[PDB]
């Protein structure tokens, strides 16, 4: 897990030897793994590249971070408001700093991860201090231009 780098944000043009060919300049990528879905039978955008040394994986994570690969925000990492279609290049501290401009955050946010890879699932949950920050996130942040990924902010629970 230390020598392997988890890549997120892969489109349909990216393939299993294509990621190994793109990561060959960063370091000696020994193997590439792409988990296939059960309903569609294709990649879900997240994969893994197992290299030989941990320094090559660190250089690939520091070089290929927030890159625009196949029209997709590909990024390598070390393997009541709901935000969907978020970029995997952002972290919890980056999401807390991005959410601090609209309103005040009550605590540190959390992002959902896949049970197989564990880098990024695609959705996240963040809680605001009051309902005014949630309304400002649903008015402004729900549709704002993020890092090559259109996010969507919505209410997790609402009572009619």
């Amino acid at each position: 897990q230390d020598a392997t780098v988890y890549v997120g944000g892969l489109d349909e043009k990216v393939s299993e030897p294509l990621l190994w060919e793109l990561f060959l300049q960063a370091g000696p990528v020994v193997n590439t793994h792409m988990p296939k879905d059960r309903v569609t039978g294709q990649h879900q955008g997240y994969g893994f590249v197992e290299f030989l040394s941990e320094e090559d994986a660190d250089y690939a994570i520091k070089i290929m971070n927030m890159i625009k690969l196949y029209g997709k925000p590909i990024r390598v990492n070390k393997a009541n408001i709901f935000i969907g279609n978020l970029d995997p290049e952002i972290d919890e501290k980056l999401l807390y700093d991005t959410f601090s401009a609209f309103g005040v955050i009550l605590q540190t946010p959390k992002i959902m991860r896949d049970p197989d890879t564990g880098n990024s699932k695609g959705y996240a949950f963040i809680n605001f201090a009051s309902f005014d920050a949630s309304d400002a996130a649903i008015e402004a942040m729900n549709g704002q231009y993020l890092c090559n990924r259109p996010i969507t902010v919505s209410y997790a629970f609402k009572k009619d």
């Binding site: 009051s130 309902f131 005014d132 309304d135």
Partner: protein
């Protein structure tokens, strides 16, 4: 982080003995080729340096132990218990004020989510 904290404590001790706002022992040190990034207010350590300077100024008070001796806080446990009870009452009043502010914010959020947003009038 011990050397930076010691430098901040030395700057707070040297700046508290000044007779003016700008005529201090640290303003002339900035022009004497001494790098001090904690003097600018843009850094996060400046908020702690200001609190250290405030504590150094409060350590120079006449009831702080320079020319007088405290008798109520040092020789009366009942006065300390009354001060602790007053601090607990102030904390309870602050918690009640925060709960009232949260209730007012919830009432404003309930009133804003129930008003009609289709009756537009441009005058």
């Amino acid at each position: 982080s011990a050397f930076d904290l010691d430098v901040v404590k030395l700057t707070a001790q040297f700046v508290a003995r000044n007779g003016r706002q700008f005529l201090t022992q640290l303003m002339q040190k900035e022009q004497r080729n001494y790098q001090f990034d904690f003097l600018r207010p843009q850094h996060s350590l400046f908020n702690y340096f200001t609190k250290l300077v405030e504590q150094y100024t409060k350590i120079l008070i006449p009831p702080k132990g320079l020319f007088s001796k405290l008798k109520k806080e040092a020789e009366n446990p009942r006065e300390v218990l009354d001060q602790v009870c007053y601090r607990v009452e102030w904390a309870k009043f602050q918690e009640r004020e925060r709960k009232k502010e949260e209730e007012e914010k919830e009432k404003e959020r309930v009133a804003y989510a129930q008003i009609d947003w289709h009756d537009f009038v441009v005058v």
